[PDB]
Amino acid sequence: VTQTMKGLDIQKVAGTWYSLAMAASDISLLDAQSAPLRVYVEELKPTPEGDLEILFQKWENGECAQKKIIAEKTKIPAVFKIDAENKVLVLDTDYKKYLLFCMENQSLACQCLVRTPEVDDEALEKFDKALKALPMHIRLSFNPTQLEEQCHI
Amino acid sequence: VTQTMKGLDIQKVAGTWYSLAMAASDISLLDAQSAPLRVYVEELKPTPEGDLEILFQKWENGECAQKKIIAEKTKIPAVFKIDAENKVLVLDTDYKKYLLFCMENQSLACQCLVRTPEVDDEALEKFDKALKALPMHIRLSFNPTQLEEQCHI
Ligand SMILES: CCCCOc1ccc(OCCCN2CCOCC2)cc1
Numbered sequence: 001v002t003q004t005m006k007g008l009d010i011q012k013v014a015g016t017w018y019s020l021a022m023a024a025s026d027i028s029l030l031d032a033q034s035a036p037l038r039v040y041v042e043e044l045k046p047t048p049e050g051d052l053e054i055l056f057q058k059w060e061n062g063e064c065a066q067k068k069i070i071a072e073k074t075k076i077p078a079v080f081k082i083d084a085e086n087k088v089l090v091l092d093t094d095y096k097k098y099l100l101f102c103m104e105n106q107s108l109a110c111q112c113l114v115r116t117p118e119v120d121d122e123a124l125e126k127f128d129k130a131l132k133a134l135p136m137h138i139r140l141s142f143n144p145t146q147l148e149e150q151c152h153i
Numbered sequence: 154v155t156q157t158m159k160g161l162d163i164q165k166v167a168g169t170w171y172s173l174a175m176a177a178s179d180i181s182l183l184d185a186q187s188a189p190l191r192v193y194v195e196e197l198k199p200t201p202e203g204d205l206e207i208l209f210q211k212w213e214n215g216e217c218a219q220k221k222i223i224a225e226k227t228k229i230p231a232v233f234k235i236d237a238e239n240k241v242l243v244l245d246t247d248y249k250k251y252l253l254f255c256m257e258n259q260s261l262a263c264q265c266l267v268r269t270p271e272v273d274d275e276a277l278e279k280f281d282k283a284l285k286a287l288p289m290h291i292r293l294s295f296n297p298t299q300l301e302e303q304c305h306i
Pocket residue numbers: 013037039041044052054056069082084088090099101103
């Protein structure tokens with residue numbers, strides 16, 4: 001991934017988001033509800049120190065779990081670390097409407113986040129252009145009804 | 154689906170094909186290996202009377218089954234019936250290289266077939282343009298290694 005947001009202000013991505021679409025390099029990363037990168041973003045909480053707390057939902061052991069992770073800042077404003085060593089990259093955002101991001105170790109999953117439970121064609125067009133560059137083999141998108149449900153059921 | 158091949162010659166789609174990509178209106182139609190429209194085309198055998206015999210593979214009861222169905226001709230050369238009542242529509246083909254088709258009852262799944270175990274960017278570009286018109290929520294594509302495996306494992 002060689003697309004990062006120039007001039008990202010991480011404080012301005014705070015608040016409510018919706019995983020409108022997801023894509024990944026390998027089908028098994030997104031195919032089942034319990035697939036390991038099938039994660040439904042709920043909220044972004046950037047720290048004063050410029051780390052990024054992420055609230056999301058994930059299907060585990062036949063139910064919709066609440067999850068929290070902290071993505072630690074790097075010297076690049078648009079790149080963050082989750083290690084156990086995995087990177088979060090912010091590709092593009094207008095803060096008000098949409099945010100595109102990828103998670104990578106090579107394995108890769110990207111999402112189109114939106115602020116509201118609505119299908120944003122413009123945001124989906126920007127997400128498809130960013131994926132043109134990448135070796136994706138699965139792509140999912142959700143309707144407004146699913147966006148208001150736990151784990152997009 | 155309002156895209157059909159003008160002037161289809163069904164005899165000329167005979168022989169070997171590869172399901173390079175699939176898409177569907179609903180995620181559950183393609184998400185698991187055992188998902189009901191996860192079908193891997195092997196061969197098309199048009200009859201002299203202009204019906205279309207289809208050999209494909211499908212994952213069922215934890216294994217890769219061989220399957221045969223006959224799609225019966227209609228008054229429209231590009232449209233065929235499988236009833237239990239479901240339509241097969243040929244969108245576009247050059248006979249030599251690629252064939253795009255959709256199956257519909259509304260539920261909808263479309264494939265990009267190719268003649269060889271190779272990623273045909275041109276064919277994938279034509280498949281993405283045909284899907285622009287349609288309400289797809291899942292899309293899959295396979296690498297050359299998977300295309301040579303039973304059930305694309
Ligand atoms: C704008 C930033 C959005 C990033 O949102 C997420 C990034 C990574 C996530 O990871 C969820 C779990 C994936 N990893 C599996 C391995 O252990 C660490 C977590 C979840 C949301």
